[PDB]
Amino acid sequence: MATGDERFYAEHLMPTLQGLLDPESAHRLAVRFTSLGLLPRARFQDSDMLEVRVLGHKFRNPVGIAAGFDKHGEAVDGLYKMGFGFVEIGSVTPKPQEGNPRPRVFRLPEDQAVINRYGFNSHGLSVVEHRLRARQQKQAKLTEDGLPLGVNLGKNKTSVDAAEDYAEGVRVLGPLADYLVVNVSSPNTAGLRSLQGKAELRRLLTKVLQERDGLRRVHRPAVLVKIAPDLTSQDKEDIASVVKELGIDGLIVTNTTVSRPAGLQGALRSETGGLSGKPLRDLSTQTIREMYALTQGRVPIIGVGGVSSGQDALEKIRAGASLVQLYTALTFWGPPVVGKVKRELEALLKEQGFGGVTDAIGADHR
Ligand SMILES: Cc1cc2nc3c(=O)[nH]c(=O)nc-3n(C[C@H](O)[C@H](O)[C@H](O)COP(=O)(O)O)c2cc1C
Ligand SMILES: CC/C(O)=C(\C#N)C(=O)Nc1ccc(-c2ccc(F)cc2)c(C(=O)OC)c1
Ligand SMILES: O=C(O)c1cc(=O)[nH]c(=O)[nH]1
């Protein structure tokens, strides 16, 4: 049934697609195809067990699309139709930019992994602002029905003041976002990840929250920080402190890794960039675990990295995540992966004696 669809995509459709197109062309086609909503609605009906209340909002299910698939806000509606409980677009930079030269996305099918070095290719704030404005009341209804929208902000390659880039993003897209993400963890913009250090981070985030707080109350988003899986213990302890001190609304844990775990088999494993997918999974889960402990369970976490199943999702939830995202799993399993994760998650939750997702959040720590 759903298993027959899963198998079709996994064994026939996706490998054929991966044979005809390069990874970037495939990405661009998927965004186009998804934006038209051509694929029929996902059959899976979200149970009440999957509902989460966090970040000032209701999420009808805890499975979202990670930043990077839809950088420019072109496919938001098509992604809700696929069954995602929330959609995050971006990263968006203030001014339009190309990103890095091609080729810049690489598949590692033997590892169920991707490496990318897009470098924040972005239509920029103005284009994305108008795109979101065109569908603003549709989104207001989606959100009220439990399907929120996040906006992930980046910075221009050549920008002098990182904090002003993020501030601009807060000003322009904050009023259109249920939550904002300060992406300080892209491996593909020089200097960016050092925004994660204590002094810079506190200065940056103070400016961001101050700009957010200046928005009219009805258009005031939660602000989250997205961190790398490659942080030192000092880094993490420092982020936890700053986040608690400033009252940051949550964390996204994690971005892609600049590491190359032992055992990667893919021919393209030494390409420069962020690695995503299955080899990232446990490194992300452990980072979630640590950040939840360091913040005493008081700071919501969206868990991301290598989620391709219900077990993967629950592991992150039990480690401390209130919500989860995926992207890379889609490039191997296609759209059916979304219903797969939700069905399996629900089964596992029953099986382990949780009334719903909310009861499982942080359970490993208790
Ligand atoms: C093609 C590609 C582009 C990405 N671009 C962004 C980005 O613009 N901003 C961001 O915060 N994360 C970006 N990500 C990182 C993902 O949001 C996510 O953190 C990471 O891929 C781990 O999740 P995954 O294993 O499910 O794919 C990108 C990932 C990939 C695969
Ligand atoms: C990492 C860049 C990347 O996106 C890919 C690669 N390589 C890739 O294959 N993407 C990719 C390719 C195909 C799909 C997809 C497959 C069937 C369908 F009806 C709609 C989209 C998706 C998808 O479901 O997006 C929501 C993503
Ligand atoms: O645009 C990119 O290169 C990119 C950004 C990011 O945050 N993460 C990632 O893996 N790639």
Round to whole Å and give the CA distance between 153 and 151. Answer: 6
The residues near 64 (Cβ < 8 Å, ≥ 6 apart) are: 84, 85, 86, 87, 88, 150, 302, 323, 324, 325, 326
How many other β-carbons are positioned within 10 Å of the β-carbon of residue 293?
16
Q: Which CATH superfamily is domain 1-366 in?
A: Aldolase class I (3.20.20.70)
Token digits for 94?
């203030």
Cis peptide before 185 (omega within 30 of 0): no
121 is in an annotated binding site: no
Cα–Cα distances (Å) from 4 to 18, 114, 318, in that order, read: 20, 25, 30
Q: Tell me which of 24, 25, 32, 33 to substitute to probe ligand 2's pocket, judged by most ligand atoms within 8 Å of the beta carbon.
A: 33
What distances in angstroms separate CA 135 from CA 207, 209, 218, one per listed residue? 29, 26, 17
**Three-state SS at 222:** strand
Instruction: Please indicate the experimental technique that yielded this structure.
Output: X-ray
| Residues assigned a catalytic role | 186
Torsion of CA 35, 118, 161, 165, to 10 degrees: 0
Q: Å resolution of this model?
A: 2.2
Neighbours of 26 (CB within 10 A): 17
Distance in Å, CA 3 to ligand 2 centroid: 19
Where are the domains positioned within the chain? 1-366
Residue 301 Ramachandran class (φ > 0 left, ψ -120 to 50 alpha, else beta): beta
Instruction: Write phi, then psi, for 114 (nearest 5 degrees).
Output: -130, 150
Residue 277's nearest CA partner among 64, 48, 107, 120 is: 107
Nearest to 11 by CA among 107, 81, 109, 114: 109
Task: Yes or no: say if 156 and 165 are a contact pair by the CB < 8 Å rule.
Answer: yes
Whether 255 has a binding-site annotation, put simply, is yes
Per residue, what are the HEC states of 96-159?
CECCCCCCCEEEECCCCEEEECCCCCECHHHHHHHHHHCCHHHHHHHHHCCCCEEEEECCCCCC
Other CB atoms closer than 10 Å to residue 129's CB: what's the count?
18
Output the CA 357–ligand 1 centroid distance in Å: 24
* Site to substitute for ligand 3 among 97, 105, 188, most atoms within 8 A of C-beta: 188
